[PDB]
Amino acid sequence: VRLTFADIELDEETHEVWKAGQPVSLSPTEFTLLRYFVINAGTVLSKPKILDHVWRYDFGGDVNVVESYVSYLRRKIDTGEKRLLHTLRGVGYVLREPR
Template identity: 40%
Template structure:
């Protein structure tokens, strides 16, 4: 299990990292929100643990940034502040749990396990008629596509093309195969409509460091699963 810990107090971070590693977790430590921001947007974690009082950008602001980017990783906030207003502010910013310092390490482990169980159950509840391709979820019943939990607006033809590519993920499909499946067998084979719609899809689903649809030179396209 991968955990990101954002804590600037060396005494606390040493204690938490040591305990988590002893319990079988893999931990990446950041001493500031700015450092964590560069990592969390490009790396997948099972749980994010962060302190509220950080130098520069604080934990509440970092939580809002993470949620703004549609990253749904469970967030556990650590804080020496125990007022109701502080807890409400953390939870309203997008955090999933709040733990007051000082805390017993067994309680920290218990809360981490609870957060990961909840995430596991949520994933199990995904409808059997969905297609999953990395961060994309295609709901075939509702004819809807979601990325990081956020809905992506696609035209009917874009959706049909995406479904065909997803159903054949990790398999190279030719332009002719795509034409037949999406536009019909009698469609003009000399058209560049496939390339145009592939471009449309890429503009909507590709992320800064990840391209879902690969061009296979001289053959066609492949969606990587």
């Protein structure tokens, strides 16, 4: 039942995450972001549905906080400038293997 995509492995029981076989420590909110991002791999994820589903509806903060979140995800697993979690202008981000 473990969720795997390319080189990212996740276990839903103890919430540990493996990048290319190397375990990394990850924050809970970013863990939910990553879980959603794999569970909808192959479909672009834009911000409004990110705040709608992943985050609470009482969230009154700015839009830059989720950007900082995806920034920590970038520096966590796909540190390269070209990364598995690509971005789209105005349509948020998506995790797919580059072609």
